[PDB]
Each structure stands twice: as C-alpha cells, then as structure tokens.
Amino acid sequence: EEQIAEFKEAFSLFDKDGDGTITTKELGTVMRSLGQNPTEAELQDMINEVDADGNGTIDFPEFLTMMARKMKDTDSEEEIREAFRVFDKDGNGYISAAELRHVMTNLGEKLTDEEVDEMIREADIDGDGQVNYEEFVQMMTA
Amino acid sequence: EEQIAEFKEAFSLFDKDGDGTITTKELGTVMRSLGQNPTEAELQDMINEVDADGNGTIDFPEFLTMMARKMKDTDSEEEIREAFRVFDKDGNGYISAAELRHVMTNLGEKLTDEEVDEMIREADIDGDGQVNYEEFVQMMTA
Amino acid sequence: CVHLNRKVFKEHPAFRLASDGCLRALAMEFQTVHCAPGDLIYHAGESVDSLCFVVSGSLEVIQDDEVVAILGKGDVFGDVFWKEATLAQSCANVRALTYCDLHVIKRDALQKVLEFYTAFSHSFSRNLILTYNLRKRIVFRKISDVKREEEERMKRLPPDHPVRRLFQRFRQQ
Amino acid sequence: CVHLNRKVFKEHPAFRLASDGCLRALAMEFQTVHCAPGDLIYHAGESVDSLCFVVSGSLEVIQDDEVVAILGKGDVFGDVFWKEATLAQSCANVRALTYCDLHVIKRDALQKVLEFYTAFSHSFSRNLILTYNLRKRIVFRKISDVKREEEERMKRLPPDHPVRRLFQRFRQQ
Amino acid sequence: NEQDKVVLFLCTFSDITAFKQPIEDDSCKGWGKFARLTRALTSSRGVLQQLAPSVQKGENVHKHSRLAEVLQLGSDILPQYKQEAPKTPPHIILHYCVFKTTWDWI
C-alpha cells in the first residue's frame, strides 16, 4: 500500500544497471554476494515462477503483483481497506460527501442531504469535508 | 400612524406646484409620465370618489382618511392599538399612572394607589413613570 | 484600617458593641469612597450590594425626580443584607449634594464577617437601623399630578376583555 | 463605557428598551474589538462564547470555503446564549473584510446581566434577532460538485454488512 | 474574483409599480390601489426621476434613467471582491512612497 513506494529503493538495489529489467546474471551476482551459490537453472525457475511477462526481465509493477500476493493483511484491516475501496470509488485516500452520495445511490439505501452531511461531519474530525482512513475507522470501531 | 408623516414626501411629490391642492391637470401629468393615459373624466371620477371636500383639490389630512381606510391592520395589532387609544386618553404615546387611575375609574374596577403603582412599575422597564407601546405589549403578550 | 474607619466605628450604635477582632475584620473590608457634588452613587435599578455609612457631607435620594431622603453625617443606607439574603435593584438614585465621604462595605464581605462573628451579628441586626432602604419602593403621588387629575375628574367589555385579564393578573400578584 | 458603546445602544432595537442601570451594567462588560482585514474572529469549531455587534466595517462568514453571510454595520452574530444555555463550537470562520469595529460581550457576563434584569431579559429575547447563528450548521451543495455528480450519474451485502450497521446508527441519530 | 472566478450575484432592485398597472385581489378602492402603488414606487419617482413627472411621456425616460444609473454602474461597480490595496486617483503621489521618500531626502 504505502510501503509500495518504500520498496522502490530495494528494487533499484536489486538490478545492477538499474534498468527496470531484472537480469538473471545480476540476480546470480547478488545471491553470490549474499553467500548462497544457486544454479542458474533454479534461478530461471524462479524467474518463470515469479514474472508475469516471463522474458528474463521483470519490472517493478511486475513485482507489485507478488507484493500484493505476499501482503496478506489481517481480517479487520483488509475489511476496512476493502470498505475503503468500495466506499471511495476514486481511491484518492479521502471520502467526499458526493462520493458518499454516489455510494448511497449504489447501496440502495438512499439518504437525505442533511443526513449525509451529518454523517460526513460526525465522521470528520479535522473538518475539511473529507474523512481519512483513521477517521473511517474512528467510527467503524464501536 | 407613524408613517403618516412619512407619506408627506410622497404627498409633496404628488402636486406640481406644492400648494396642498391636488390638481386634476397635475394628476393627469403624473399619470402620463407614469406611462398610463387616462381620460380626465375617470380622473374626475377618482377625485369625486376620493376627496371628502370634493372641489377639484384635496389636502393631506383629506388624504389621511383614505390612508386610514387603506391601513387595515391585523387583529391583535389593531386590538392593542385600540386598547392604547382607550387606555391612553390623551393619545400621547405614554401611559401616566394618573392616566391609569382615570381609566381605573372609567373601567369600574377601582384599584388602590399602591396596586396601580405596582402595575405601572411591573409594566415599565426603563423606569420613567410612563410605559410604551412595547412596554404595553410586553405584558399583553402572555 | 481601624483608624481610617474610626469615623464609623466610634459614632455608630451598631458598632459600639463590636469586638476588637471583629473591628479589625470589618475595617479590612471597608472602603472609604469620596464623591463629588452631583456625582451619584447608586443608579435607579443598580444592584445595591454595599451599605454605605455617610461619614461626611450630605446626600439626597431621588426617586422619580423627587427627593425622598436627605442623608447627613453618620447615616447608613443600602440594603439590609443579612435579613434580605438576595440582591435587589436600587429603587432610587442617590445624588451627592456636597463633597461627601462614605464608608462602603460590600454585601459579600459583610456577610462573611457576620457569619463568622455570630454573637456580633445579632447585635448588628438589632442596632443598625438603615436610614434609607434602597430596596423598598416608596409609593406616593405628586401634588401637581393630583391637582391635574382632580381637574380631569371635574372635567369628565370590548376594551375590558384584553384589559380585565391583566387586571386579574394584578389581583393574583 | 455607555458612551463608548453608544454605537450599539442607540442603534439596536434590542437595546432601545434598556433601563439606565441595565445600560451601565451592560457597558461595563462590553469590549470594543478592532480587527484588521483578513484577521478572522471565530475559527471553525472555536467556542462561541461572545455575541458580537458589528458597529463598523464588514465581515464575511465562510463555512466550507463558501461565503454564507456578509455582516455589515449594526449586525449581531454569535450564539443565542439565554436560549441555548450551553457552549457550542462555531460552524464557520468569520473573516474580516475591512478594518472593523465589533462590540463583543461574553456569554457569562451577558447571562449575569440578563439574570439580574429579568424584566429586560424577555425584551432582549424578543427583540434581538441574531444576524448569523454561529452555532447552527447550514446545509447546502456546491454547484460545481452537483455538476460533477450529475456527470457521474450520467456516466454510471458483503460490503453492506459493515456499512448498513452505521447507516442504521445514523437512522437512530 | 481576483482570480476572475464568479463568486457572488449582485442583484439591484427598484420599483416599476406606478409605471406598469394597478392590480388588486381586493381593495377599498381603485384609488386606494393607486395610492399603494405610489407609496411603493418611491425611490425612483419621488427622488430620482423628479424632472420627469412635470413633463409627459415619461415612462420610457424614467425607466431609462433608473436603468442607466445601474448600466453605468455595470462598468463602474465591478468591485471584484478582492482584498486589494486602496488606491488614490493617479497624478496624486503617495506619502510613504519610495520615490517620494528619496525626493524628500534630496
């Protein structure tokens, strides 16, 4: 999620030329400096088992799929994050009152404008019209 | 009532010479500048239907009768204004305690001097011995 | 402070029974107040929270443009605090005739001293007659208005329904 | 102080019934406040403990980046204290347009004066209409957001179980 | 705005009551309805359009005068709602100006 850009230093530390192309020779070099001696055959098996393109070179959003695989968050954390994904359609980290109006139309339960503004304002704490992930969980707690 | 003197600018704006004499020719001129073209016959009908003197010229207290006709105030406002007219005999906008003594004699229910002074003082707020229209309605409310 | 308020404490019969410690506890809360001529002390409707001892000069008490009491040297006005136990509005203006020296004492401070000196408080209540109660309303009539009303009395249900109601309210008062 | 706050006491219909003693007791607790342009008075969510009389200049009331009321000469804003009897947060910022002179009065001092002058307090409640209640929230919609939502409405139970619960909470609200 | 975005609607009001027609649902008189219309249309006729009612055919002239005040204002009062610096008319130099300060120094 937010550590996706924090992995970018590690991903630039992966390749030796820094080309966005995960070489087999560069991976063998970094494992050899790690202290393991793997064969190139099992490293090619790892390439064909990891890469979605699968051409001897992989990218950083091509690793984002494996990052989403190895993420594996909790129960309630994934619940509120998926509720953020369906509840914010733009995914911009904020809940506009018009976004809550659109998901009130898409929920089936239609609410008034005063009630939807009161739901925003009870949800909001800093008071800028949009609520945060923390402001979302602050009412999803109890 | 209080707008009677505020109509005096309009009444001086009615006549052209400003003589206290509503001319038929001046009324035809001001309607012609208004954008209507009435005949002088219907304007003479309006003169004979409006003026209490009825001589081709009318005055400002001669219009005060039509102003009292077209006043047509509310129920409770006219009630408290007529209660002011019977309750203040001088009509001076104030209720002296001796005025309340005279209307206590003319009401039939005679009260003591201490009770009539207490009625004045409970009625009065600014405390000058006389009460106002607003001080009258302030106890006539509830 | 006892020497400053000796002009109260030697002249008043309420204070001729005061203990020495009670005299200290009173004089530390007294305030000497000088007033100019025409510089009034209490407005009409002002809160009377301080009974004042006029130790010098003369004062007049104007209720409804009429002088009601002249206060001279050694006269106590204000409100009887220990018996009233509530704040009231002043009935009358208290204009100052001359350069006067009063010795006021606030209601809260006087009540503190009288609650602490319980044996003195009964003597104070029995011996301090207020010269003019500023709380109580004095009913009267002006002679000019009585004369004009006699002239008018020699000259002289649709209104009563929004009027007798109020009258009955005043009967319930 | 009555002469300093004559700009309130001669112009407001709430104060045209005020007694002389009540006028003194109000003006001793009034505070004239000068503000610079762009120097706002109440924040969003600040406690509104002081109703202000704008005796000079002009103010704007910004709720959610939108001007909601322009206050001019002789306009009263704040919160209706004697009827609310509780402190509330301000709904909106109150930015100052020009160099303005307000005449504020704190809620506690105004409540003291209105509790002591009981005959005046009813007249104050009947004659002081607040120009802008800072307590009450004004619901509206922005035209640009309504236009974008109309564009989105032309373009368009596993989530509902942790969501409809909250919805029902809002139904209980 | 200062950013040239529209932010307010100024709508200016006047009365064309006396210059259109009298119409009443109920009245003491047609004369009374005329009196109420003359009491309404005051700020134009009784004040601004005072050279009109002596002359005749003044309806278009009075409407043009009352609208031409606001029409010249449609270019004059474009106050733009900006917290801008107050300015003097030109050919009037400021007191604390840098040129005026170095002029006073020389």
XYZ file of C-alpha atoms in Angstrom:
736
model
C 0.000 0.000 0.000
C 2.056 2.912 1.329
C 5.240 0.810 1.541
C 4.940 0.111 -2.205
C 6.973 3.232 -2.929
C 9.200 2.310 0.033
C 10.155 -0.912 -1.761
C 11.498 1.152 -4.706
C 14.885 1.596 -3.012
C 15.115 -2.187 -2.669
C 14.040 -2.670 -6.278
C 16.682 -0.247 -7.538
C 19.089 -2.129 -5.261
C 18.075 -5.381 -6.984
C 19.318 -4.648 -10.512
C 22.950 -3.720 -11.132
C 22.472 -1.414 -14.126
C 19.188 -0.009 -12.794
C 17.229 -0.573 -15.998
C 13.862 -1.852 -14.794
C 14.948 -5.254 -16.128
C 15.701 -7.960 -13.561
C 18.638 -9.783 -15.124
C 19.425 -13.408 -14.378
C 23.145 -12.596 -14.155
C 22.503 -9.700 -11.759
C 20.353 -11.947 -9.561
C 23.077 -14.595 -9.557
C 25.611 -11.926 -8.592
C 23.539 -10.603 -5.697
C 22.830 -14.128 -4.393
C 26.546 -14.929 -4.735
C 27.376 -11.871 -2.643
C 24.598 -12.928 -0.267
C 26.531 -16.128 0.431
C 24.386 -18.679 -1.373
C 25.523 -20.384 -4.577
C 22.377 -21.214 -6.573
C 22.454 -22.652 -10.039
C 21.164 -20.584 -12.941
C 18.581 -23.304 -13.656
C 16.729 -22.821 -10.362
C 17.071 -19.051 -10.788
C 15.407 -19.377 -14.202
C 12.731 -21.471 -12.483
C 12.299 -18.578 -10.044
C 12.050 -16.148 -12.980
C 9.370 -18.231 -14.716
C 7.573 -18.719 -11.373
C 7.729 -15.008 -10.465
C 7.458 -12.888 -13.607
C 4.132 -12.188 -15.295
C 5.851 -11.202 -18.534
C 8.406 -14.005 -18.244
C 11.154 -12.943 -20.642
C 14.296 -12.912 -18.489
C 13.471 -9.402 -17.255
C 10.783 -8.131 -14.886
C 9.536 -4.713 -13.797
C 8.565 -3.020 -10.526
C 4.763 -3.117 -11.100
C 5.525 -6.628 -12.371
C 6.752 -7.196 -8.812
C 3.735 -5.349 -7.368
C 1.651 -8.467 -8.114
C 3.977 -10.590 -5.962
C 3.890 -7.806 -3.359
C 0.081 -7.954 -3.291
C 0.382 -11.737 -3.035
C 2.812 -11.608 -0.098
C 0.937 -8.725 1.584
C -1.691 -10.936 3.307
C -3.125 -8.450 5.799
C -5.370 -9.140 8.806
C -9.136 -9.679 8.927
C -10.443 -6.287 10.061
C -7.632 -4.348 8.352
C -8.460 -5.932 4.991
C -12.164 -5.424 5.766
C -11.799 -1.682 6.301
C -9.394 -1.373 3.350
C -11.850 -3.135 1.028
C -14.608 -0.973 2.509
C -12.403 1.999 1.625
C -12.006 0.656 -1.912
C -15.755 0.231 -2.437
C -16.622 3.304 -0.346
C -14.156 5.584 -2.131
C -14.523 4.865 -5.829
C -11.686 7.191 -6.842
C -9.303 5.613 -4.322
C -7.818 9.024 -3.506
C -7.495 8.404 0.235
C -10.466 10.636 1.026
C -14.246 10.419 1.218
C -16.048 13.323 -0.388
C -19.672 13.880 0.560
C -20.547 13.472 -3.118
C -18.641 10.180 -3.041
C -20.807 9.134 -0.116
C -23.846 10.280 -2.118
C -22.785 8.080 -5.050
C -22.285 5.068 -2.802
C -25.600 5.870 -1.112
C -27.222 5.568 -4.527
C -25.218 2.394 -5.227
C -26.027 0.946 -1.785
C -29.789 1.028 -2.292
C -30.393 2.882 0.960
C -30.866 6.489 -0.147
C -30.392 9.204 2.467
C -31.169 12.911 2.587
C -28.566 15.608 2.015
C -28.702 16.802 5.628
C -28.323 13.254 6.953
C -25.439 12.510 4.586
C -23.742 15.778 5.568
C -24.229 14.920 9.237
C -22.670 11.505 8.582
C -19.673 13.245 6.976
C -19.376 15.768 9.817
C -19.689 13.160 12.573
C -17.093 11.132 10.666
C -14.813 14.121 10.081
C -12.662 15.488 12.902
C -10.279 17.963 11.274
C -13.212 19.351 9.285
C -12.286 19.679 5.618
C -15.286 17.884 4.073
C -13.337 14.656 3.518
C -12.567 11.954 6.041
C -9.467 9.819 6.372
C -8.738 6.123 6.849
C -8.278 6.925 10.532
C -11.485 8.970 10.543
C -13.169 5.998 8.848
C -12.003 3.534 11.497
C -12.812 6.071 14.238
C -16.497 5.415 13.617
C -16.024 1.818 12.463
C -14.559 0.989 15.898
C -17.640 0.790 18.125
C -49.786 56.001 12.289
C -46.062 56.776 12.353
C -45.752 56.512 8.553
C -48.369 59.277 8.221
C -45.609 61.878 8.330
C -43.523 59.565 6.120
C -46.173 59.870 3.399
C -45.659 63.674 3.357
C -42.734 63.378 0.930
C -44.995 61.422 -1.424
C -47.789 63.955 -0.993
C -45.476 66.857 -1.809
C -44.312 64.735 -4.752
C -47.946 64.424 -5.880
C -48.695 68.084 -6.634
C -46.548 70.034 -9.091
C -46.824 73.488 -7.509
C -46.836 72.101 -3.958
C -49.919 74.011 -2.835
C -51.857 71.481 -0.770
C -54.317 71.351 -3.680
C -54.398 68.150 -5.737
C -54.970 69.447 -9.256
C -56.626 67.374 -11.954
C -54.064 68.583 -14.509
C -51.156 67.705 -12.204
C -52.602 64.227 -11.645
C -53.005 63.762 -15.393
C -49.397 64.865 -15.875
C -48.015 62.453 -13.289
C -50.068 59.542 -14.683
C -48.900 60.488 -18.192
C -45.296 60.347 -17.008
C -46.160 57.090 -15.242
C -46.971 55.569 -18.631
C -50.748 55.335 -18.437
C -53.029 57.578 -20.497
C -56.253 58.018 -18.501
C -59.031 60.312 -19.556
C -59.832 63.356 -17.444
C -63.368 62.004 -16.939
C -62.230 58.930 -14.999
C -59.733 61.108 -13.123
C -62.616 63.388 -12.111
C -64.480 60.239 -11.057
C -61.444 59.381 -8.924
C -61.488 62.907 -7.454
C -65.186 62.683 -6.551
C -64.652 59.138 -5.212
C -61.577 60.111 -3.157
C -61.952 63.662 -1.858
C -64.069 64.494 1.180
C -64.251 68.157 0.197
C -64.694 67.333 -3.490
C -63.853 70.604 -5.230
C -61.087 69.664 -7.674
C -58.474 69.999 -4.921
C -57.723 67.837 -1.885
C -55.464 68.137 1.153
C -53.073 65.878 3.074
C -55.377 65.271 6.092
C -58.042 64.949 3.387
C -55.909 62.019 2.223
C -55.426 60.812 5.816
C -58.993 59.441 5.683
C -58.101 57.292 2.661
C -54.877 56.341 4.458
C -56.879 55.166 7.482
C -59.149 53.302 5.066
C -56.263 51.547 3.295
C -54.370 50.928 6.565
C -56.287 47.735 7.514
C -54.009 46.371 10.232
C -54.018 42.894 11.804
C -56.236 41.507 14.570
C -54.002 41.741 17.645
C -52.168 44.847 16.393
C -55.449 46.736 15.998
C -56.579 45.292 19.348
C -53.574 46.653 21.233
C -53.712 49.951 19.314
C -57.391 50.431 20.193
C -56.542 49.409 23.758
C -53.880 52.124 23.633
C -56.469 54.609 22.370
C -58.942 53.825 25.158
C -56.193 53.224 27.734
C -54.344 56.456 26.956
C -56.985 59.152 26.668
C -54.506 61.855 25.650
C -53.021 59.659 22.913
C -49.523 60.938 23.707
C -47.787 57.582 23.260
C -47.367 57.115 27.007
C -49.336 55.812 29.974
C -49.141 58.002 33.043
C -50.105 56.456 36.365
C -52.783 59.138 36.672
C -53.999 58.093 33.222
C -54.254 54.544 34.521
C -56.090 55.923 37.568
C -58.599 57.689 35.298
C -59.187 54.547 33.256
C -59.431 52.572 36.501
C -62.278 54.874 37.492
C -63.779 54.566 33.994
C -63.339 50.771 33.979
C -65.468 50.201 37.070
C -62.790 48.132 38.783
C -61.179 50.588 41.198
C -57.709 49.751 42.499
C -55.532 51.132 45.276
C -52.687 53.566 44.682
C -50.026 51.021 45.649
C -51.528 48.381 43.355
C -51.824 50.838 40.464
C -48.226 51.970 41.010
C -47.102 48.341 41.083
C -48.969 47.762 37.811
C -47.121 50.742 36.297
C -43.751 49.577 37.641
C -44.209 45.966 36.519
C -45.274 47.367 33.144
C -42.403 49.856 32.982
C -38.882 48.689 32.146
C -36.862 51.856 31.555
C -38.473 53.363 34.656
C -39.730 56.869 33.920
C -43.294 56.527 35.260
C -44.783 56.056 31.782
C -44.877 52.900 29.713
C -44.568 52.497 25.968
C -46.444 50.604 23.264
C -43.708 47.984 23.522
C -43.950 48.026 27.318
C -47.720 47.636 26.898
C -47.384 44.590 24.649
C -44.621 43.211 26.899
C -47.271 42.420 29.497
C -50.078 41.881 26.984
C -48.066 39.001 25.469
C -48.583 36.178 27.970
C -7.812 50.485 58.684
C -9.483 50.703 62.101
C -8.082 54.212 62.416
C -9.322 55.065 58.925
C -12.832 53.856 59.753
C -12.899 55.282 63.274
C -15.454 57.777 61.886
C -17.843 54.842 61.557
C -16.737 52.750 64.485
C -16.839 55.451 67.153
C -20.123 57.009 66.030
C -22.370 54.169 65.240
C -24.503 52.433 67.831
C -24.337 49.284 65.747
C -20.560 49.299 66.116
C -20.337 50.325 69.759
C -20.695 46.639 70.696
C -18.038 45.416 68.273
C -15.182 43.260 69.496
C -11.611 44.229 68.694
C -11.093 41.305 66.326
C -14.446 41.957 64.686
C -13.413 45.587 64.263
C -10.215 44.527 62.503
C -12.154 42.062 60.345
C -14.624 44.782 59.375
C -12.126 47.551 58.741
C -10.008 45.394 56.481
C -13.049 45.126 54.174
C -14.345 48.692 54.464
C -13.710 51.103 51.585
C -13.693 54.853 52.060
C -15.256 56.478 48.989
C -15.122 60.193 48.235
C -17.754 61.598 45.906
C -18.054 64.910 44.097
C -21.201 67.056 44.105
C -23.697 65.778 41.575
C -21.718 62.522 41.324
C -24.343 59.976 42.191
C -23.604 56.674 43.869
C -26.443 54.300 43.040
C -28.389 54.452 39.814
C -32.028 53.592 39.540
C -32.057 49.832 39.221
C -28.384 49.382 40.074
C -27.565 46.464 42.341
C -27.367 47.533 45.990
C -24.564 45.285 47.185
C -22.926 47.716 49.593
C -24.374 49.532 52.570
C -22.699 52.894 52.930
C -22.053 54.992 56.019
C -22.100 58.684 55.182
C -19.357 59.900 57.478
C -19.124 63.352 55.919
C -21.213 65.510 53.655
C -24.800 65.188 52.564
C -26.605 63.044 50.016
C -30.066 63.146 48.515
C -32.197 60.228 47.404
C -34.110 60.956 44.214
C -36.925 58.551 43.373
C -38.913 59.590 40.272
C -37.441 63.120 40.097
C -38.399 63.670 43.758
C -36.150 63.929 46.791
C -37.162 61.205 49.216
C -34.463 61.323 51.911
C -31.530 63.579 52.739
C -28.646 61.666 54.286
C -26.350 63.588 56.581
C -23.363 62.804 58.755
C -23.491 59.300 60.183
C -26.405 57.825 58.250
C -26.484 54.284 56.916
C -28.117 53.461 53.637
C -28.082 50.481 51.336
C -29.946 47.223 51.826
C -30.411 45.078 54.916
C -28.246 42.250 53.658
C -28.314 39.734 56.499
C -32.117 39.782 56.540
C -32.709 40.013 52.783
C -30.211 37.328 51.598
C -30.767 38.356 47.962
C -29.556 41.079 45.637
C -32.085 43.702 44.618
C -32.150 46.624 42.258
C -31.969 50.118 43.667
C -35.243 51.962 43.877
C -33.761 55.424 43.638
C -30.814 57.480 42.530
C -28.564 58.705 45.330
C -27.138 62.024 44.199
C -24.383 63.664 46.209
C -25.006 67.178 47.481
C -21.552 68.170 48.724
C -18.111 66.655 48.624
C -19.017 63.604 50.670
C -17.081 60.797 52.314
C -18.896 57.472 52.526
C -17.551 54.258 54.004
C -18.997 51.432 51.959
C -18.745 47.715 52.659
C -19.750 45.066 50.145
C -22.530 42.594 50.901
C -20.308 39.541 50.496
C -17.615 40.852 52.838
C -20.147 41.999 55.429
C -21.918 38.656 55.254
C -18.591 36.857 55.729
C -17.854 38.918 58.828
C -21.357 38.484 60.227
C -21.327 34.744 59.590
C -18.020 34.408 61.380
C -18.935 36.679 64.317
C -22.281 35.110 65.165
C -22.519 36.793 68.555
C -21.951 40.164 66.900
C -24.383 39.629 64.025
C -27.463 39.659 66.260
C -26.306 42.904 67.858
C -25.725 44.364 64.401
C -29.216 43.365 63.286
C -30.762 44.823 66.415
C -28.777 48.063 66.432
C -28.298 49.035 62.765
C -31.396 50.790 61.538
C -30.931 51.719 57.912
C -31.594 55.381 57.258
C -32.904 54.616 53.777
C -33.675 51.155 52.453
C -32.671 51.396 48.827
C -34.540 48.166 48.083
C -38.046 49.121 49.169
C -40.223 51.128 46.809
C -41.907 54.179 48.321
C -45.349 54.864 46.917
C -46.584 58.443 46.756
C -48.290 60.952 44.477
C -47.123 64.251 43.056
C -49.214 67.256 44.090
C -49.183 68.706 40.567
C -50.379 65.416 39.094
C -53.024 65.071 41.824
C -54.195 68.607 41.005
C -54.347 67.844 37.278
C -56.210 64.602 37.969
C -58.713 66.460 40.150
C -59.188 68.884 37.249
C -59.765 65.939 34.904
C -62.190 64.331 37.383
C -64.075 67.626 37.440
C -63.974 67.853 33.633
C -65.166 64.290 32.916
C -66.369 44.911 27.639
C -64.764 45.029 24.114
C -61.976 47.130 25.709
C -62.277 45.281 29.014
C -61.689 41.762 27.667
C -57.970 42.284 26.805
C -57.670 44.526 29.897
C -59.518 42.920 32.806
C -57.446 39.791 32.198
C -54.342 41.782 33.090
C -56.289 43.309 35.973
C -56.928 39.837 37.374
C -53.264 39.024 36.892
C -52.541 42.010 39.132
C -55.115 40.634 41.561
C -53.086 37.419 41.626
C -49.923 39.489 42.189
C -18.449 52.835 28.896
C -22.023 53.766 27.962
C -20.595 56.492 25.748
C -18.135 54.025 24.226
C -20.923 51.567 23.421
C -23.435 54.197 22.320
C -22.901 52.792 18.796
C -24.658 49.647 19.999
C -27.070 51.136 22.475
C -28.548 53.830 20.242
C -28.859 51.656 17.135
C -30.142 48.385 18.316
C -33.820 47.640 18.757
C -32.911 45.124 21.428
C -31.297 47.911 23.434
C -33.872 50.627 22.830
C -35.846 49.252 25.799
C -32.862 49.107 28.146
C -33.016 50.777 31.537
C -30.284 53.181 32.580
C -28.903 50.844 35.235
C -29.080 47.914 32.837
C -27.202 50.020 30.294
C -24.441 50.700 32.819
C -24.346 47.019 33.789
C -24.047 46.015 30.137
C -21.495 48.605 29.093
C -19.179 47.764 31.952
C -18.909 44.246 30.472
C -18.809 45.149 26.777
C -15.468 45.016 24.957
C -14.802 47.002 21.810
C -12.634 44.907 19.481
C -10.915 46.248 16.377
C -9.955 43.754 13.696
C -7.708 44.010 10.661
C -8.709 42.849 7.174
C -8.264 39.115 6.829
C -7.963 38.838 10.626
C -10.708 36.398 11.424
C -12.623 36.370 14.679
C -14.045 32.885 15.149
C -12.353 29.772 13.858
C -14.210 26.750 12.645
C -15.013 24.841 15.799
C -13.974 27.626 18.163
C -16.223 28.165 21.159
C -18.803 30.886 20.507
C -18.987 32.461 23.945
C -19.446 36.064 22.854
C -22.104 37.619 20.667
C -20.615 40.491 18.724
C -22.226 43.661 17.415
C -20.538 44.822 14.231
C -20.685 48.562 14.750
C -18.335 49.388 11.888
C -16.943 47.641 8.862
C -17.956 44.427 7.187
C -17.387 40.760 7.940
C -17.884 37.588 5.958
C -18.868 34.176 7.253
C -17.029 31.367 5.493
C -18.437 27.879 6.001
C -16.622 25.212 3.941
C -14.752 27.713 1.728
C -18.073 29.418 0.900
C -19.338 32.814 1.997
C -22.589 32.287 3.864
C -23.390 35.729 5.304
C -21.954 39.223 4.984
C -22.290 41.207 8.196
C -22.467 44.963 7.880
C -22.947 47.890 10.217
C -25.153 47.037 13.173
C -25.461 43.273 12.797
C -25.398 40.844 15.699
C -23.776 37.471 15.398
C -22.709 34.818 17.847
C -24.959 32.355 19.635
C -28.315 32.846 21.329
C -26.979 32.310 24.822
C -30.034 32.759 27.030
C -31.977 30.219 24.974
C -29.146 27.757 24.312
C -27.662 27.556 27.863
C -24.688 25.549 26.551
C -21.419 26.267 24.795
C -21.137 25.150 21.191
C -18.431 25.073 18.588
C -18.516 27.592 15.783
C -19.831 26.323 12.493
C -17.923 28.764 10.338
C -14.955 31.060 10.117
C -15.760 34.760 10.387
C -13.192 36.584 8.288
C -12.982 40.359 8.442
C -13.357 42.262 5.187
C -12.348 45.775 6.230
C -10.947 47.371 9.334
C -13.925 46.550 11.520
C -15.068 47.540 14.990
C -17.087 44.920 16.850
C -18.506 45.229 20.345
C -18.355 41.785 21.888
C -19.834 40.674 25.196
C -19.028 37.341 26.805
C -21.739 34.766 27.453
C -21.135 34.657 31.201
C -21.319 38.433 31.614
C -24.395 38.724 29.403
C -26.080 35.903 31.288
C -25.286 37.623 34.594
C -26.868 40.843 33.366
C -29.903 39.071 31.930
C -30.409 37.028 35.087
C -30.290 40.155 37.199
C -32.519 42.256 34.908
C -35.341 39.758 34.496
C -37.760 42.313 33.081
C -35.184 43.274 30.462
C -34.216 39.721 29.508
C -37.592 38.928 27.939
C -37.407 42.107 25.870
C -33.885 41.174 24.803
C -35.019 37.704 23.752
C -37.951 39.117 21.822
C -36.058 41.946 20.133
C -32.551 40.600 19.417
C -32.629 38.582 16.237
C -29.174 37.231 15.552
C -27.956 38.064 12.074
C -25.991 34.821 11.886
C -26.263 31.964 14.353
C -22.728 30.667 14.536
C -23.965 27.502 16.248
C -26.361 26.178 13.623
C -24.977 24.249 10.673
C -26.215 25.357 7.258
C -26.620 22.519 4.795
C -26.117 23.211 1.103
C -24.421 21.874 -2.017
C -21.753 23.347 -4.249
C -22.818 23.883 -7.861
C -19.523 22.533 -9.215
C -19.841 19.379 -7.123
C -23.505 18.997 -8.125
C -22.444 19.332 -11.772
C -19.690 16.735 -11.357
C -22.099 14.396 -9.573
C -24.629 14.794 -12.387
C -21.827 13.899 -14.808
C -21.026 10.819 -12.715
C -24.723 9.870 -12.541
C -24.807 10.115 -16.330
C -21.584 8.093 -16.621
C -22.594 5.254 -14.266
C -24.289 -7.395 1.290
C -20.567 -8.280 1.901
C -19.873 -4.513 1.665
C -23.238 -3.652 3.203
C -22.820 -5.624 6.442
C -20.091 -3.356 7.938
C -21.838 -0.354 6.324
C -25.594 -0.662 6.819
C -24.922 -1.022 10.544
C -23.524 2.504 10.542
C -26.437 3.534 8.332
C -28.871 2.332 10.988
C -26.851 4.178 13.602
C -27.481 7.314 11.547
C -31.150 6.339 11.444
C -31.072 6.297 15.245
C -29.354 9.712 15.193
C -12.817 37.363 -8.025
C -9.195 38.427 -8.019
C -8.740 35.041 -9.716
C -11.531 36.139 -12.141
C -13.935 33.414 -11.000
C -17.547 34.361 -10.423
C -18.312 34.199 -6.706
C -21.314 36.465 -5.990
C -24.512 37.615 -7.647
C -25.304 41.261 -7.062
C -28.921 41.950 -7.925
C -30.087 45.558 -7.688
C -33.733 46.378 -7.094
C -36.131 49.171 -7.974
C -39.877 49.698 -8.322
C -41.913 49.890 -11.532
C -45.173 49.675 -9.594
C -46.584 53.058 -10.612
C -45.344 52.661 -14.182
C -46.925 49.305 -15.046
C -50.520 48.931 -13.761
C -52.686 48.695 -10.648
C -53.984 45.192 -9.933
C -55.695 44.196 -6.682
C -57.173 40.963 -5.401
C -59.336 43.085 -3.067
C -59.201 46.751 -2.125
C -61.119 49.603 -0.561
C -60.726 51.463 -3.855
C -59.032 51.533 -7.205
C -57.856 54.888 -5.874
C -56.528 53.031 -2.826
C -54.654 50.575 -5.037
C -53.217 53.563 -6.921
C -52.214 55.116 -3.588
C -50.461 51.904 -2.534
C -48.656 51.805 -5.895
C -47.474 55.399 -5.462
C -46.332 54.608 -1.928
C -44.385 51.645 -3.316
C -42.663 53.261 -6.322
C -40.934 55.917 -4.240
C -37.156 55.785 -4.768
C -37.454 56.391 -8.499
C -40.329 58.850 -8.834
C -40.269 60.859 -5.608
C -36.469 61.188 -5.518
C -34.507 60.404 -8.672
C -36.994 60.988 -11.505
C -38.185 64.425 -10.419
C -37.705 66.202 -13.751
C -39.988 63.583 -15.315
C -43.472 63.998 -13.738
C -43.927 67.642 -14.712
C -43.391 66.557 -18.337
C -45.450 63.867 -20.062
C -44.473 60.628 -21.882
C -42.028 60.000 -19.054
C -42.336 56.212 -18.691
C -39.510 55.212 -21.035
C -37.442 58.212 -19.881
C -37.736 57.339 -16.179
C -37.074 53.649 -16.865
C -34.028 54.609 -18.938
C -32.735 56.901 -16.178
C -33.187 54.331 -13.397
C -31.658 51.574 -15.524
C -28.896 53.842 -16.858
C -27.667 54.554 -13.339
C -27.186 50.793 -12.941
C -25.937 50.481 -16.542
C -23.111 52.946 -15.912
C -22.648 51.066 -12.637
C -22.311 47.839 -14.667
C -18.896 49.138 -15.696
C -18.182 51.342 -12.657
C -19.046 48.986 -9.774
C -17.195 45.882 -10.840
C -15.822 45.698 -7.300
C -14.381 42.190 -7.927
C -14.376 41.143 -4.204
C -10.610 41.252 -3.700
C -8.572 42.216 -0.638
C -6.623 44.738 -2.705
C -4.651 47.796 -1.705
C -6.646 51.041 -1.515
C -5.575 53.426 -4.245
C -5.687 57.151 -4.756
C -6.560 58.516 -8.194
C -3.470 58.887 -10.394
C -1.408 62.079 -10.610
C -1.624 62.014 -6.777
C 1.567 60.634 -5.252
C 1.658 58.552 -2.076
C 3.072 59.811 1.205
C 5.235 56.845 2.206
C 6.302 56.131 -1.395
C 9.901 55.188 -2.162
C 10.211 57.878 -4.830
C 8.618 60.439 -2.501
C 10.925 59.385 0.347
C 14.068 59.781 -1.740
C 12.590 63.048 -3.058
C 12.155 64.315 0.496
C 15.697 63.189 1.268
C 17.216 65.057 -1.671
